[PDB]
């Protein structure tokens, strides 16, 4: 999309990730599984909830009876009343249709941005320790157990702790 991640360099979504909108997939000796990034997902839920409530709650009306009744010699004001009713209809129909179109595009872009930013955060943490193998995936140059995975998903990855082990494996494999 606008940020190139959803339906972009990350081609498809995950049906096996049920606890959030954005997240991770890992695999090591101990197995594999899916986990949502709770921080980014909760921000998106807060933003989208606010976006929905704003579109609805900013419409506050007063008590009003639209209808009017006119006799056979009041045709001009009857048509004037019809013009007012039709004019509001056209304004509200046009604005409502376009607001939905424009906000849907921005919402899909917003989700695309979040997935893009999540990938970039991980890439900035891992640096040389992992290889970008495409499709939003990193393949480590050092074994990364469940505890190591939790550090990445929590943003507490210790690059120097594995930097030398990754360096040796990176330098051999590239020789």
């Amino acid at each position: 999309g606008l940020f190139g991640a959803i339906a972009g360099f990350i081609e498809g979504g995950w049906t096996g990730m049920v606890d959030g909108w954005y997240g991770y997939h890992h695999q090591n000796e101990q197995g594999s599984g899916y986990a949502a990034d709770l921080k980014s997902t909760q921000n998106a839920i807060d933003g989208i909830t606010n976006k929905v409530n704003s579109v609805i709650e900013k419409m506050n009306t007063q008590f009003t009876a639209v209808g009017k009744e006119f006799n056979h010699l009041e045709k001009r004001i009857e048509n004037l009343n019809k013009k007012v009713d039709d004019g509001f209809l056209d304004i509200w129909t046009y604005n409502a249709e376009l607001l939905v179109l424009l906000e849907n595009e921005r919402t899909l872009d917003y989700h695309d941005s979040n997935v893009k930013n999540l990938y970039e955060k991980v890439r900035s943490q891992l640096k040389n320790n992992a290889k970008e193998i495409g499709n939003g995936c990193f393949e480590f140059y050092h074994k990364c157990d469940n505890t190591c995975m939790e550090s990445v998903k929590n943003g507490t990855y210790d690059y120097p702790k594995y930097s030398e082990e990754a360096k040796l494996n990176r330098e051999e494999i590239d020789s």
């Binding site: 008590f63 009003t64 009876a65 639209v66 209808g67 009017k68 009744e69």
Partner: protein, 55 residues
Amino acid sequence: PKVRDQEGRMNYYWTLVEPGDKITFEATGNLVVPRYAFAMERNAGSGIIISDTPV
């Protein structure tokens, strides 16, 4: 022209008498005097819905 077998006609009028005011009817004929009036307090808004939808 006959409408409901009547070649005559009858016009209907109404007025709102403010509290404490007086209304006088005087005639030498042709007057359909009031018998029941209505003391009332108007609201603001609402209208008349014309429909077969049930209450």
